[PDB]
Motif scaffolding. Structure first.
Motif, PDB file in Angstrom:
ATOM      1  N   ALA A   1      86.342  39.004  19.851  1.00 30.38           N
ATOM      2  CA  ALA A   1      87.728  39.027  19.394  1.00 30.38           C
ATOM      3  C   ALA A   1      87.835  39.202  17.876  1.00 30.38           C
ATOM      4  O   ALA A   1      88.708  39.927  17.394  1.00 30.38           O
ATOM      5  CB  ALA A   1      88.454  37.744  19.832  1.00 30.38           C
ATOM      6  N   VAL A   2      86.959  38.541  17.122  1.00 24.87           N
ATOM      7  CA  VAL A   2      86.960  38.701  15.674  1.00 24.87           C
ATOM      8  C   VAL A   2      86.700  40.153  15.289  1.00 24.87           C
ATOM      9  O   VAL A   2      87.397  40.709  14.429  1.00 24.87           O
ATOM     10  CB  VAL A   2      85.913  37.781  15.010  1.00 24.87           C
ATOM     11  CG1 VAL A   2      85.716  38.157  13.555  1.00 24.87           C
ATOM     12  CG2 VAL A   2      86.346  36.331  15.142  1.00 24.87           C
ATOM     13  N   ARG A   3      85.712  40.767  15.936  1.00 24.61           N
ATOM     14  CA  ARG A   3      85.371  42.151  15.630  1.00 24.61           C
ATOM     15  C   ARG A   3      86.490  43.110  16.024  1.00 24.61           C
ATOM     16  O   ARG A   3      86.788  44.062  15.294  1.00 24.61           O
ATOM     17  CB  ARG A   3      84.064  42.531  16.324  1.00 24.61           C
ATOM     18  CG  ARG A   3      82.852  41.837  15.705  1.00 24.61           C
ATOM     19  CD  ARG A   3      81.630  41.922  16.597  1.00 24.61           C
ATOM     20  NE  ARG A   3      81.184  43.300  16.801  1.00 24.61           N
ATOM     21  CZ  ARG A   3      80.380  43.958  15.971  1.00 24.61           C
ATOM     22  NH1 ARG A   3      79.934  43.366  14.869  1.00 24.61           N
ATOM     23  NH2 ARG A   3      80.024  45.205  16.247  1.00 24.61           N
ATOM     24  N   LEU A   4      87.126  42.846  17.160  1.00 24.57           N
ATOM     25  CA  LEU A   4      88.260  43.663  17.607  1.00 24.57           C
ATOM     26  C   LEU A   4      89.442  43.564  16.632  1.00 24.57           C
ATOM     27  O   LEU A   4      90.083  44.574  16.288  1.00 24.57           O
ATOM     28  CB  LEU A   4      88.687  43.233  19.009  1.00 24.57           C
ATOM     29  CG  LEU A   4      89.911  43.920  19.608  1.00 24.57           C
ATOM     30  CD1 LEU A   4      89.716  45.430  19.649  1.00 24.57           C
ATOM     31  CD2 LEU A   4      90.176  43.377  21.008  1.00 24.57           C
ATOM     32  N   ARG A   5      89.735  42.350  16.175  1.00 26.08           N
ATOM     33  CA  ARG A   5      90.783  42.120  15.191  1.00 26.08           C
ATOM     34  C   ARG A   5      90.511  42.893  13.895  1.00 26.08           C
ATOM     35  O   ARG A   5      91.388  43.581  13.352  1.00 26.08           O
ATOM     36  CB  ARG A   5      90.889  40.620  14.909  1.00 26.08           C
ATOM     37  CG  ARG A   5      91.996  40.197  13.969  1.00 26.08           C
ATOM     38  CD  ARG A   5      91.701  38.787  13.476  1.00 26.08           C
ATOM     39  NE  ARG A   5      90.481  38.761  12.672  1.00 26.08           N
ATOM     40  CZ  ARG A   5      89.832  37.659  12.307  1.00 26.08           C
ATOM     41  NH1 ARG A   5      90.269  36.468  12.678  1.00 26.08           N
ATOM     42  NH2 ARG A   5      88.735  37.752  11.569  1.00 26.08           N
ATOM     43  N   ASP A   6      89.287  42.772  13.402  1.00 18.81           N
ATOM     44  CA  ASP A   6      88.933  43.374  12.121  1.00 18.81           C
ATOM     45  C   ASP A   6      88.988  44.893  12.202  1.00 18.81           C
ATOM     46  O   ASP A   6      89.624  45.544  11.368  1.00 18.81           O
ATOM     47  CB  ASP A   6      87.544  42.907  11.671  1.00 18.81           C
ATOM     48  CG  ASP A   6      87.524  41.439  11.237  1.00 18.81           C
ATOM     49  OD1 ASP A   6      88.610  40.825  11.120  1.00 18.81           O
ATOM     50  OD2 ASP A   6      86.418  40.903  11.001  1.00 18.81           O
ATOM     51  N   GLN A   7      88.343  45.452  13.220  1.00 22.21           N
ATOM     52  CA  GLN A   7      88.299  46.906  13.383  1.00 22.21           C
ATOM     53  C   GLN A   7      89.650  47.489  13.780  1.00 22.21           C
ATOM     54  O   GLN A   7      89.999  48.601  13.379  1.00 22.21           O
ATOM     55  CB  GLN A   7      87.241  47.289  14.414  1.00 22.21           C
ATOM     56  CG  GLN A   7      85.838  46.913  14.002  1.00 22.21           C
ATOM     57  CD  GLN A   7      84.802  47.559  14.887  1.00 22.21           C
ATOM     58  OE1 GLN A   7      84.451  47.029  15.938  1.00 22.21           O
ATOM     59  NE2 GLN A   7      84.309  48.720  14.470  1.00 22.21           N
ATOM     60  N   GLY A   8      90.417  46.732  14.551  1.00 22.24           N
ATOM     61  CA  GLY A   8      91.718  47.185  15.005  1.00 22.24           C
ATOM     62  C   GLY A   8      92.764  47.233  13.906  1.00 22.24           C
ATOM     63  O   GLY A   8      93.693  48.044  13.960  1.00 22.24           O
ATOM     64  N   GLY A   9      92.618  46.365  12.910  1.00 25.33           N
ATOM     65  CA  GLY A   9      93.557  46.307  11.801  1.00 25.33           C
ATOM     66  C   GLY A   9      93.655  47.634  11.081  1.00 25.33           C
ATOM     67  O   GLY A   9      94.736  48.055  10.656  1.00 25.33           O
ATOM     68  N   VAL A  10      92.515  48.297  10.947  1.00 24.34           N
ATOM     69  CA  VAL A  10      92.448  49.602  10.309  1.00 24.34           C
ATOM     70  C   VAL A  10      93.323  50.615  11.056  1.00 24.34           C
ATOM     71  O   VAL A  10      94.125  51.332  10.457  1.00 24.34           O
ATOM     72  CB  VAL A  10      90.997  50.108  10.259  1.00 24.34           C
ATOM     73  CG1 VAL A  10      90.930  51.468   9.592  1.00 24.34           C
ATOM     74  CG2 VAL A  10      90.111  49.095   9.533  1.00 24.34           C
TER      75      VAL A  10
ATOM     76  N   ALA B   1      84.997  28.874  22.028  1.00 22.13           N
ATOM     77  CA  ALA B   1      84.522  28.331  20.754  1.00 22.13           C
ATOM     78  C   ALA B   1      83.889  29.403  19.859  1.00 22.13           C
ATOM     79  O   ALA B   1      83.538  30.492  20.325  1.00 22.13           O
ATOM     80  CB  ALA B   1      83.526  27.201  21.011  1.00 22.13           C
ATOM     81  N   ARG B   2      83.721  29.088  18.575  1.00 17.24           N
ATOM     82  CA  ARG B   2      83.187  30.040  17.589  1.00 17.24           C
ATOM     83  C   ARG B   2      81.806  30.587  17.919  1.00 17.24           C
ATOM     84  O   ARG B   2      81.469  31.711  17.533  1.00 17.24           O
ATOM     85  CB  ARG B   2      83.125  29.398  16.199  1.00 17.24           C
ATOM     86  CG  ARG B   2      84.458  29.327  15.504  1.00 17.24           C
ATOM     87  CD  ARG B   2      84.295  28.863  14.053  1.00 17.24           C
ATOM     88  NE  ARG B   2      83.821  27.487  13.970  1.00 17.24           N
ATOM     89  CZ  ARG B   2      84.592  26.422  14.159  1.00 17.24           C
ATOM     90  NH1 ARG B   2      85.877  26.578  14.438  1.00 17.24           N
ATOM     91  NH2 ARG B   2      84.078  25.201  14.078  1.00 17.24           N
ATOM     92  N   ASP B   3      80.998  29.794  18.614  1.00 16.51           N
ATOM     93  CA  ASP B   3      79.624  30.177  18.909  1.00 16.51           C
ATOM     94  C   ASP B   3      79.503  30.889  20.256  1.00 16.51           C
ATOM     95  O   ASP B   3      78.498  30.741  20.953  1.00 16.51           O
ATOM     96  CB  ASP B   3      78.716  28.940  18.881  1.00 16.51           C
ATOM     97  CG  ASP B   3      79.005  27.960  20.016  1.00 16.51           C
ATOM     98  OD1 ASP B   3      80.044  28.096  20.702  1.00 16.51           O
ATOM     99  OD2 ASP B   3      78.190  27.032  20.216  1.00 16.51           O
ATOM    100  N   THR B   4      80.526  31.654  20.629  1.00 20.61           N
ATOM    101  CA  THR B   4      80.473  32.375  21.894  1.00 20.61           C
ATOM    102  C   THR B   4      80.627  33.868  21.691  1.00 20.61           C
ATOM    103  O   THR B   4      81.259  34.317  20.733  1.00 20.61           O
ATOM    104  CB  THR B   4      81.550  31.913  22.882  1.00 20.61           C
ATOM    105  OG1 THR B   4      82.862  32.221  22.370  1.00 20.61           O
ATOM    106  CG2 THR B   4      81.433  30.404  23.172  1.00 20.61           C
ATOM    107  N   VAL B   5      80.052  34.637  22.613  1.00 20.79           N
ATOM    108  CA  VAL B   5      80.157  36.090  22.564  1.00 20.79           C
ATOM    109  C   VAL B   5      81.631  36.524  22.686  1.00 20.79           C
ATOM    110  O   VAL B   5      82.032  37.548  22.139  1.00 20.79           O
ATOM    111  CB  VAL B   5      79.265  36.740  23.670  1.00 20.79           C
ATOM    112  CG1 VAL B   5      79.717  36.349  25.081  1.00 20.79           C
ATOM    113  CG2 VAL B   5      79.199  38.248  23.503  1.00 20.79           C
TER     114      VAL B   5
END
Length: 123
Positions: A99-108, A90-94
């Motif tokens: 995964a969101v941070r990995l997606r964002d940083q990985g896109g670069v 769920a959204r409120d989990t570490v």
């Protein structure tokens, strides 16, 4: 044939580039949340939820067997890591937040990797 050898050299070159990409992407998971497959001993229902599990260790195995023929195949597996996590957790989990941070940083990283693959002509 000489042509087969040339194709094999291109694949070896692609594999070298993807190894660098993989190292850079895994650096964006400092918690090592995505380092290993989800344990079916610890999460016994996982395959009821997730039909194609993926993780960095499994990607590395395929990579060293030269099992990625192009960047798209590599990206497919990276996206599985992220997308599987964002469905199971769920959204409120570490886990989801990692995964969101990995997606964002990985896109670069992946944006420039696409340019390099096209430019040098590795696929």
């Amino acid at each position: 044939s000489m042509e087969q050898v040339a194709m094999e050299l291109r694949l070896t070159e692609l594999t070298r580039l993807l190894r660098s990409v993989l190292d850079q992407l895994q650096d964006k998971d400092p918690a090592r949340i995505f380092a290993q497959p989800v344990s079916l001993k610890e999460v016994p229902d996982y395959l009821d939820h997730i039909k194609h599990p993926m993780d960095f260790a499994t990607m590395r195995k395929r990579l060293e067997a030269q099992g990625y023929k192009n960047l798209h195949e590599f990206e497919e597996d990276f996206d599985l890591i992220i997308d599987n996590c964002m469905k199971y957790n769920a959204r409120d989990t570490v886990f989801y937040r990692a995964a969101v941070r990995l997606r964002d940083q990985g896109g670069v990283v992946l944006r420039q990797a696409r340019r390099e693959v096209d430019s040098i002509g590795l696929e």
